[PDB]
Amino acid sequence: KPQLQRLAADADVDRMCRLLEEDGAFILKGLLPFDVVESFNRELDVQMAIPPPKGERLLADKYPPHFKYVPNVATTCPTFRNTVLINPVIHAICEAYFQRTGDYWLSAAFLREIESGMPAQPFHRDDATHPLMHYQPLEAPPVSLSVIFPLTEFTEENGATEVILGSHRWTEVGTPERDQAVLATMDPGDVLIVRQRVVHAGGGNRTTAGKPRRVVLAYFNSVQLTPFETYRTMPREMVESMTVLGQRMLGWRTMKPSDPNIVGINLIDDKRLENVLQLKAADSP
C-alpha cells in the first residue's frame, strides 16, 4: 500500500510541489533543530498550564472535549513567532505553492493536545474555514496550505495524523473509512505538509499511560482570504520585534495578490499599511 513520501529537509522545492499535486501530502524529515522544538514546547507548557477562560470560547464550545486547545500561538510563543513562522524552507515551499495566486499569509496557527483515551477526530478538509474554497476547480490557483508540526512523536498508538492520499480529487468528503488513510508517523522536528482539499484527521490517542500527543497546525492562506485569527491586537512592541516576513504573515503589512490585481490589498489612505503605522521591524532598521 502506498505511503506518505518522506523527504530530506534540503530536498528540491519543485519536487515537493509535484508531490502535493500527485499525492496531496508529504513529510519533511528533521526540519527543526532539537533546541527549537524544545523551547517551543516549554512555551506551550506555559499556556497549557493556564486554566481555560470562564466566558465564551468560540471554537472549543462547538466541539466535544476530545482535545485541549491553545489558540493563536503566535501571540504567546516567541519561538513560533520569531523562528518557526519564518522558517526558510517552509517559505520556499509556500512561494512555489502560491506562485500563481500571489502573496500568502497566516490565517491561523494553534496547538491541540490529545491526551490518553481521546477518540479520533472526524475526517475533514481545512477548506471549511472559507466555504468558497469548495467551488474552486482543482486547476485553479491554490489558495490554502496546511503545515502540521509534530511537537511530540507521532505513532500508530498515540493517533498520528491520518491522511487520505489523492483525496483532493474527490468532489465531496463523504464518510470515509479509517483504513483508507495513511499514518503520518513522525519524530519531533519533522513537518507534515497537506495540500488544499486533502482529506485528513487526527488519530485519537490509544496509549494507556503517557504524555499527550502534541501537534501545532499552521494554516497559510492566500492574502485574498480573511485570516481566521486576527493578530491586530498584538502589542506594538511585540510586532515591531518581528522581522518583515513575520509582520507580513500576521497581517500588519500591505500584501499583493497576483494580477489582475495590480495595486495590492490591506492598504489604507492609498498608502502601505506599514508606512501609515510607521511600523519598525527587527530586520528593517
Next chain:
Amino acid sequence: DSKPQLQRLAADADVDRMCRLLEEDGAFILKGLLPFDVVESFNRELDVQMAIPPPKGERLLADKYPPHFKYVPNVATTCPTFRNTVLINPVIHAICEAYFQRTGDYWLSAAFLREIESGMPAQPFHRDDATHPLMHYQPLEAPPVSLSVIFPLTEFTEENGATEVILGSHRWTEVGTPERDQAVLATMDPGDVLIVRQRVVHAGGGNRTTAGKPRRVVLAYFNSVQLTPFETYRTMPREMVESMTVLGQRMLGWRTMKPSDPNIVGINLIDDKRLENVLQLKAADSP
C-alpha cells in the same frame, strides 16, 4: 422593441425582485434612495478632502494609472455622512442580506470617490472581481461573494460619462476587449444608486463635456467576510469607531463575523473570543 436598457426601480421595491434582476440582467438602478441633502452633505465633506494639498509620496492606486480621474480613498474615515448614514442605509442592507444569504456575513471591502473633470477619457472595461483574482474561477452558480454599489453624487449623463454596464456580461467567461456600444448607460440623478453584480463588466464613461462641473461617483464595494478587505479600517481612532452603530462597526472589520456553514465557528476572531469583546468595544446603539 429597442435596445435593452438598465431597469429603474423605486427604492421601496421588493428585494427578491431586485435579486432576480441581478441574476437576469446583472445590474439595476434604484431611484430616490438617498435624500438630496444627504448627497449634498456627502459632497461637501468630500469638498474638504479635495482642498487638502496632495500628499508628497507613494500612492498605490493613483500611481498605477494615468491622470484621468481624481481620487479620494476610504471615504468612511473622512466623511461622517457616509460613515453614519449612507453605509448603514437599510435598503442597501436589505439587498445585501438577500444577495449574500448563501455566503453568510458581508462587510465593506472599499469605498472611494472618483472625480472626472471635463475632457478626461474613459475608464477601461473591467470587473471589480479583479481585487480578488480567485473570484474568476468561481462557478456562476456558486454563492456570490462580491457586490458593487455605485452612488452618483452628480448627475450622470451621456456627455459627462455615466457608468457603462454590459448587461448579461456576468455570463461571460472572460472580459476580453469589448466595444463601448455593447454597454448601456446608467444615467442617474443624485440620490439614485446603481447595483452591479459580481462578474458584470462595466466602466466609467469619461467626461466629454467641454465645460462644466466634474462627474462625481462613489463606489461602495461589499465582499463576503471570507475575502480580505481591500482597504483596512484598523487605523481608525477608537473614539470614531465607538461613535458608529454595531452594523457600521461590522462593515469596517471591527467585529467578529460569521461565514455560512461549514464554518460553524466564525472569522476575524482572536484568543478564541469575539474581537469586539477583546477590545471592549462600545457602540452608539449597543449600551
